[PDB]
Design a protein around this ligand. Structure first.
Ligand SMILES: [Mg+2]
Ligand SMILES: [Mg+2]
Ligand SMILES: [Mg+2]
Ligand SMILES: [Mg+2]
Ligand SMILES: [Mg+2]
Ligand SMILES: [Mg+2]
Ligand SMILES: [Mg+2]
Ligand SMILES: [Mg+2]
Ligand SMILES: [Mg+2]
Ligand SMILES: [Mg+2]
Ligand SMILES: [Mg+2]
Ligand SMILES: [Mg+2]
Ligand SMILES: [Mg+2]
Ligand SMILES: [Mg+2]
Ligand SMILES: [Mg+2]
Ligand SMILES: [Mg+2]
Ligand SMILES: [Mg+2]
Ligand SMILES: [Mg+2]
Ligand SMILES: [Mg+2]
Ligand SMILES: [Mg+2]
Ligand SMILES: [Mg+2]
Ligand SMILES: [Mg+2]
Ligand SMILES: [Mg+2]
Ligand SMILES: [Mg+2]
Ligand SMILES: [Mg+2]
Ligand SMILES: [Mg+2]
Ligand SMILES: [Mg+2]
Ligand SMILES: [Mg+2]
Ligand SMILES: [Mg+2]
Ligand SMILES: [Mg+2]
Ligand SMILES: [Mg+2]
Ligand SMILES: [Mg+2]
Ligand SMILES: [Mg+2]
Ligand SMILES: [Mg+2]
Ligand SMILES: [Mg+2]
Ligand SMILES: [Mg+2]
Ligand SMILES: [Mg+2]
Ligand SMILES: [Mg+2]
Ligand SMILES: [Mg+2]
Ligand SMILES: [Mg+2]
Ligand SMILES: [Mg+2]
Ligand SMILES: [Mg+2]
Ligand SMILES: [Mg+2]
Ligand SMILES: [Mg+2]
Ligand SMILES: [Mg+2]
Ligand SMILES: [Mg+2]
Ligand SMILES: [Mg+2]
Ligand SMILES: [Mg+2]
Ligand SMILES: [Mg+2]
Ligand SMILES: [Mg+2]
Ligand SMILES: [Mg+2]
Ligand SMILES: [Mg+2]
Ligand SMILES: [Mg+2]
Ligand SMILES: [Mg+2]
Ligand SMILES: [Mg+2]
Ligand SMILES: [Mg+2]
Ligand SMILES: [Mg+2]
Ligand SMILES: [Mg+2]
Ligand SMILES: [Mg+2]
Ligand SMILES: [Mg+2]
Ligand SMILES: [Mg+2]
Ligand SMILES: [Mg+2]
Ligand SMILES: [Mg+2]
Ligand SMILES: [Mg+2]
Ligand SMILES: [Mg+2]
Ligand SMILES: [Mg+2]
Ligand SMILES: [Mg+2]
Ligand SMILES: [Mg+2]
Ligand SMILES: [Mg+2]
Ligand SMILES: [Mg+2]
Ligand SMILES: [Mg+2]
Ligand SMILES: [Mg+2]
Ligand SMILES: [Mg+2]
Ligand SMILES: [Mg+2]
Ligand SMILES: [Mg+2]
Ligand SMILES: [Mg+2]
Ligand SMILES: [Mg+2]
Ligand SMILES: [Mg+2]
Ligand SMILES: [Mg+2]
Ligand SMILES: [Mg+2]
Ligand SMILES: [Mg+2]
Ligand SMILES: [Mg+2]
Ligand SMILES: [Mg+2]
Ligand SMILES: [Mg+2]
Ligand SMILES: [Mg+2]
Ligand SMILES: [Mg+2]
Ligand SMILES: [Mg+2]
Ligand SMILES: [Mg+2]
Ligand SMILES: [Mg+2]
Ligand SMILES: [Mg+2]
Ligand SMILES: [Mg+2]
Ligand SMILES: [Mg+2]
Ligand SMILES: [Mg+2]
Ligand SMILES: [Mg+2]
Ligand SMILES: [Mg+2]
Ligand SMILES: [Mg+2]
Ligand SMILES: [Mg+2]
Ligand SMILES: [Mg+2]
Ligand SMILES: [Mg+2]
Ligand SMILES: [Mg+2]
Ligand SMILES: [Mg+2]
Ligand SMILES: [Mg+2]
Ligand SMILES: [Mg+2]
Ligand SMILES: [Mg+2]
Ligand SMILES: [Mg+2]
Ligand SMILES: [Mg+2]
Ligand SMILES: [Mg+2]
Ligand SMILES: [Mg+2]
Ligand SMILES: [Mg+2]
Ligand SMILES: [Mg+2]
Ligand SMILES: [Mg+2]
Ligand SMILES: [Mg+2]
Ligand SMILES: [Mg+2]
Ligand SMILES: [Mg+2]
Ligand SMILES: [Mg+2]
Ligand SMILES: [Mg+2]
Lengths: 76, 59, 188, 136, 98
RNA sequence: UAGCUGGUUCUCCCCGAAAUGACUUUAGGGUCAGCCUCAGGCGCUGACUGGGGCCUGUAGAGCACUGAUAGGGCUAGGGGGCCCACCAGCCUACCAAACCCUGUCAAACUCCGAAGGGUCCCAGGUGGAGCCUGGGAGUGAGGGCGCGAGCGAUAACGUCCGCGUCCGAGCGCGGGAACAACCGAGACCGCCAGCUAAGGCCCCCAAGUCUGGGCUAAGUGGUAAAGGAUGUGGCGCCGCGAAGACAGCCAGGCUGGUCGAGUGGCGCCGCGCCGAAAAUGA
RNA sequence: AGAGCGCAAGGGUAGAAGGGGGCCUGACUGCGAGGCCUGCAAGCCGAGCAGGGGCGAAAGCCGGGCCUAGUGAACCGGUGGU
RNA sequence: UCCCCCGUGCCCAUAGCGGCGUGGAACCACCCGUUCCCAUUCCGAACACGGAAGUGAAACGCGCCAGCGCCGAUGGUACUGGGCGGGCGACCGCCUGGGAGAGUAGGUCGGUGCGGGGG
């Protein structure tokens, strides 16, 4: 035939979860598109990679129309 | 958290790894072995998952 | 029709059926109660009763409720009723599938045709007092290739079609013997 | 038909969605056992049906084969089967309604459906009609 | 339309919602993440005369006095569906000129 | 030279694997990781479990999207019958786009969605648990069975992955007639002690020719299908019937007489009969 | 939102990543807290710092293209520089 | 504190689509004009500036209606962690804990912060 083909797995998805302590810069979640939006103290890079901008705890916030956001609540 | 007498009666030979680990947590060595433990929510959950192996007693 | 109902509470839904009782529940804009009729009784009752005529349920509370089966859960794997809904009426108008007696010898069956019949019953807004055993359908002038729609129904007084004013009701299709078998076997 | 080449085998689990209720016609035919029903099996039944009662009423076929039936040419293991040999099949689970007649007598139907049974692989039953629908 | 508004929202604190009427020109210092206005120097519906542009300059100076009193200084302006050029221009124009 | 085959000698004691992944002129060979072990560190951190939060697109179901689809309606286009080129008009048990209804299907469809799993926090958990550094390895053909898919023919003691397991290494013990992996069970040594486990308690063969309540006349049991049949027992319904029914006997072509208590058709459950032919003796 | 997003498919997206103009060349140098992934090597995301600069009134964005392919250890040798 | 407005953030269709009614004192819009700042690949439709008078028609604000849309129990299933039984097999069944989708009843023309103008 002519089929046996596939690009190796990219291992994306939720990397960090809500209620997890995070350093500054830890990739919070790798993703295909905008399956998750940025938020409080959370930036993103060319591949739509979400990552902490501060130290603290992750939190997820669903907002229907707006979409799903993820932020880190600072504290020390 | 009254006492819980638990006696092992069905050999774990053949049951899943997790199950054997449960008996280890409760501290069950050999067959027909006695063991009285508190009735904490945690200790329950284990004794529950091995219920088909042991006979529980409310002491 | 009458039917001896009972109150349910904790009885095992499945273990119940094995006994001989059919699970069910009555309810309306204000009511909600676990019940359970009898299989054999409900059977012969609901056979004719179906879901066009009303049935008062006699609870041990002596209460005579004017209910009708809003829905029945038929069990897959060899048909048989699993569970039964019971909508309790009052005086406010209520929608429901009313029967339909198609009466007449359509031109279709004359030239050798087929008794097509879409909606063997029709949902219609209506007061609880109005309990039309059925509705006359003037099917007779219907020839092969023709059909009859909702916008052409004979509505009794105090009733309205709670459907689409264009829905079909019945039709007249052809046979299908030799002419199709020989022709289809080659033309395919 | 139309869609694309080959499909998984899949297993026939519970008789769930496979099964319904006489939705057209007067009498019906219901499956007791699961199976893949071939295109030739349907045609075999349909024709045996009408041919029984000449110039008959109307026959409804509610099931429909869309699963490509794969099959290899009597060799070994290179790639997937060419398939298509038996053509296609319909995932028929117990309780399903294959055929149902209309505009005809009870004897004609009771015989015709009985006949179109032997044409099928599965052990089947004939249902009348009752009144089991969904209303009030 | 309000692309600009969203941009500044994520920027930081102390937004400056400049909503202007066909004859009026209000201005609020709204801090997001709580939704509370601070210095709300209205225009025509406040006290000022009648000359949109020159009125805008002064109302800006109005915010300034009320703002520097509360210890504010983040010039987080809010273009608010408006082209920075005229009325709105003077707002922050005077507001930042003092 | 031999990445191949064969051979490798005393005892006791503790622990105890793997047949996987990645690359490999690699595929019966290696190197790193994984799993075993030993020494020195650390010390409640471990498997498993309780509560909590977050993540997820399966089973199921569904038709909102991508597509499939049987019938019907409504309806553009095309084919044909009337008419004539003043091109349009009328019909149309012909094929049918879009739309609606009824009814369905889909690994590569999903408006929706379990159980469950993954992870972090707090807690129980002292275990041949756990983590850090280092010494020594072997292993890198795996196989049955259960479950979930592919391939195959919904074949194979088939094949290829996933979770689990046992054999491997427990061809040590009990059962299963016999029999790695099915059921029971994890064998330090001794005993002419006792309770059990699966499985059994008529004889070979240890223990009930034990008790009570039904069914089965085929040795069914002692292990085969579509389909066929007044087998037998038990349950429910429909048609006729003391205003005389079914059956037979008299007469006419349903009706009468006689006798005199039930009779005919359908559906469901239990056990059973047929379908049932192979080669050394059952 | 069934279009568009150069190209396969997918996730994503009009509260722009899409269509159109104005100015411009951050398809910069020197670095890199901390992570994803992972046997090794490799691949990936990146706040922020200093230099000098672009667009915007400004808060601010810019270390190439909506993102996931468009590629090749080491050796040997070529050309230009300190 | 109460009521109507104007600016704005939260909840994310029970906020919406469509139908009828209402508000111009204030506020907002439409509106008058195109000389100045500024602008449309063409137009003062849009951005923009200066402003009588007129209007609430359009737009927005506030109400009411449910026909579409949306939300949507309860009961009972399907499915299924864990446990187990029957049959020769394709498969079927029970115990224990969890439990949908669809469908029925039914709900719905919004709750709500903070500042500001007005009686
Ligand atoms: Mg592959
Ligand atoms: Mg992949
Ligand atoms: Mg960047
Ligand atoms: Mg980019
Ligand atoms: Mg075992
Ligand atoms: Mg676990
Ligand atoms: Mg009637
Ligand atoms: Mg006609
Ligand atoms: Mg017609
Ligand atoms: Mg008509
Ligand atoms: Mg194609
Ligand atoms: Mg192809
Ligand atoms: Mg296929
Ligand atoms: Mg059915
Ligand atoms: Mg060969
Ligand atoms: Mg058959
Ligand atoms: Mg707020
Ligand atoms: Mg050992
Ligand atoms: Mg590689
Ligand atoms: Mg190898
Ligand atoms: Mg080979
Ligand atoms: Mg070799
Ligand atoms: Mg190693
Ligand atoms: Mg831990
Ligand atoms: Mg832990
Ligand atoms: Mg937990
Ligand atoms: Mg939380
Ligand atoms: Mg699963
Ligand atoms: Mg699926
Ligand atoms: Mg499915
Ligand atoms: Mg559709
Ligand atoms: Mg047709
Ligand atoms: Mg048609
Ligand atoms: Mg139409
Ligand atoms: Mg024509
Ligand atoms: Mg002709
Ligand atoms: Mg002419
Ligand atoms: Mg013509
Ligand atoms: Mg004709
Ligand atoms: Mg036709
Ligand atoms: Mg439907
Ligand atoms: Mg739902
Ligand atoms: Mg969930
Ligand atoms: Mg769970
Ligand atoms: Mg969950
Ligand atoms: Mg967990
Ligand atoms: Mg200890
Ligand atoms: Mg060990
Ligand atoms: Mg160990
Ligand atoms: Mg080590
Ligand atoms: Mg080591
Ligand atoms: Mg293997
Ligand atoms: Mg295995
Ligand atoms: Mg087959
Ligand atoms: Mg298969
Ligand atoms: Mg086969
Ligand atoms: Mg292999
Ligand atoms: Mg082992
Ligand atoms: Mg072992
Ligand atoms: Mg042996
Ligand atoms: Mg053995
Ligand atoms: Mg062995
Ligand atoms: Mg063994
Ligand atoms: Mg057993
Ligand atoms: Mg072991
Ligand atoms: Mg005993
Ligand atoms: Mg016995
Ligand atoms: Mg006896
Ligand atoms: Mg047999
Ligand atoms: Mg049989
Ligand atoms: Mg015969
Ligand atoms: Mg025969
Ligand atoms: Mg007998
Ligand atoms: Mg029988
Ligand atoms: Mg007689
Ligand atoms: Mg014989
Ligand atoms: Mg798109
Ligand atoms: Mg861009
Ligand atoms: Mg465009
Ligand atoms: Mg362009
Ligand atoms: Mg440009
Ligand atoms: Mg680093
Ligand atoms: Mg690395
Ligand atoms: Mg790249
Ligand atoms: Mg300089
Ligand atoms: Mg960039
Ligand atoms: Mg690119
Ligand atoms: Mg761009
Ligand atoms: Mg990617
Ligand atoms: Mg070399
Ligand atoms: Mg007032
Ligand atoms: Mg008025
Ligand atoms: Mg004018
Ligand atoms: Mg001009
Ligand atoms: Mg001029
Ligand atoms: Mg233009
Ligand atoms: Mg103008
Ligand atoms: Mg008006
Ligand atoms: Mg209005
Ligand atoms: Mg409504
Ligand atoms: Mg809905
Ligand atoms: Mg919602
Ligand atoms: Mg619901
Ligand atoms: Mg429920
Ligand atoms: Mg668990
Ligand atoms: Mg299980
Ligand atoms: Mg439960
Ligand atoms: Mg739910
Ligand atoms: Mg629901
Ligand atoms: Mg729905
Ligand atoms: Mg309300
Ligand atoms: Mg409210
Ligand atoms: Mg508000
Ligand atoms: Mg308030
Ligand atoms: Mg007053
Ligand atoms: Mg007043």
């Amino acid at each position: 035939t002519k089929n046996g083909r596939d690009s190796q797995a990219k291992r994306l998805g939720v990397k960090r979860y809500e209620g997890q302590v995070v350093r500054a810069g830890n990739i919070l979640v790798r993703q295909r598109g905008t399956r998750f939006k940025p938020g409080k103290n959370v930036g993103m890079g060319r591949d739509f990679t979400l990552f902490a901008l501060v130290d603290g705890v992750v939190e997820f916030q669903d907002r229907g129309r707006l979409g799903r956001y993820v932020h880190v609540r600072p504290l020390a | 958290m009254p006492r819980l007498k638990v006696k092992l009666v069905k050999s774990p030979i053949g049951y899943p790894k997790d199950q054997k680990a449960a008996l280890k947590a409760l501290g069950l060595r050999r067959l027909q072995q006695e063991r009285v433990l508190e009735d904490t929510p945690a200790i329950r959950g284990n004794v529950e998952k091995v219920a088909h192996l042991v006979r529980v007693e409310v002491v | 029709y009458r039917l001896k109902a009972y109150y349910r509470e904790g009885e095992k839904p499945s273990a119940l059926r094995r006994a001989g009782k059919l699970p069910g529940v009555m309810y309306n804009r204000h009511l909600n109660r676990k019940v359970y009729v009898d299989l054999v009784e409900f059977d012969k009752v609901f056979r004719q009763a179906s879901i066009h005529h009303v049935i008062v349920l006699e609870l041990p509370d002596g209460q005579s409720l004017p209910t009708l089966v809003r829905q029945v859960n038929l069990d897959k794997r060899r048909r048989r009723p699993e569970h039964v809904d019971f909508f309790v009426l009052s005086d406010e108008p209520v929608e429901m599938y009313v029967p339909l007696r198609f009466v007449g010898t359509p031109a279709g069956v004359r030239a050798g045709g087929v008794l097509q019949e879409i909606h063997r019953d029709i949902l219609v807004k209506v007061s609880p007092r109005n309990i039309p055993e059925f509705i006359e359908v003037d099917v007779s002038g219907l020839e092969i290739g023709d059909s009859l729609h909702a916008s052409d129904l004979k509505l009794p007084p105090g009733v309205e079609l709670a459907v689409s004013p264009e829905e079909t009701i019945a039709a007249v299709v052809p046979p299908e013997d030799v002419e199709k078998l020989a022709e289809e076997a080659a033309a395919e | 038909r139309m869609k694309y080449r080959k499909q998984q085998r899949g297993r026939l689990k519970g008789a769930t969605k496979g099964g319904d209720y006489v939705a057209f016609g007067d009498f019906g035919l219901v499956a007791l056992e699961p199976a893949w029903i071939t295109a030739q099996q349907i045609e075999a039944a349909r024709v045996a049906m009408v041919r029984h009662f000449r110039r008959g009423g109307k026959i409804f076929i509610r099931i429909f084969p869309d699963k490509p039936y794969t099959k290899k040419p009597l060799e070994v293991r290179m790639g997937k089967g060419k398939g298509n040999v038996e053509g296609y099949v319909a995932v028929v689970k117990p309780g399903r309604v294959m055929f149902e007649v209309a505009g005809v007598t009870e004897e004609q139907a009771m015989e015709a459906l009985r006949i179109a049974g032997h044409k099928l692989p599965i052990k089947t039953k004939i249902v009348r009609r009752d009144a089991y629908d969904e209303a009030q | 339309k309000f692309r600009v508004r969203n941009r500044i929202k994520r920027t930081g604190r102390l937004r400056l919602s400049v909503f202007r009427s066909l004859k009026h020109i209000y201005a609020q210092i709204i801090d997001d993440e709580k939704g509370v206005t601070l210095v709300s120097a209205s225009s025509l519906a406040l006290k000022l005369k009648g000359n949109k542009t020159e009125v805008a300059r002064q109302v800006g100076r109005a915010l300034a006095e009320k703002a520097l009193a509360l210890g504010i200084k983040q010039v987080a302006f809010d273009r608010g569906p408006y082209k920075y050029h005229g009325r709105v221009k003077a707002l922050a124009e005077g507001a930042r000129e003092g």
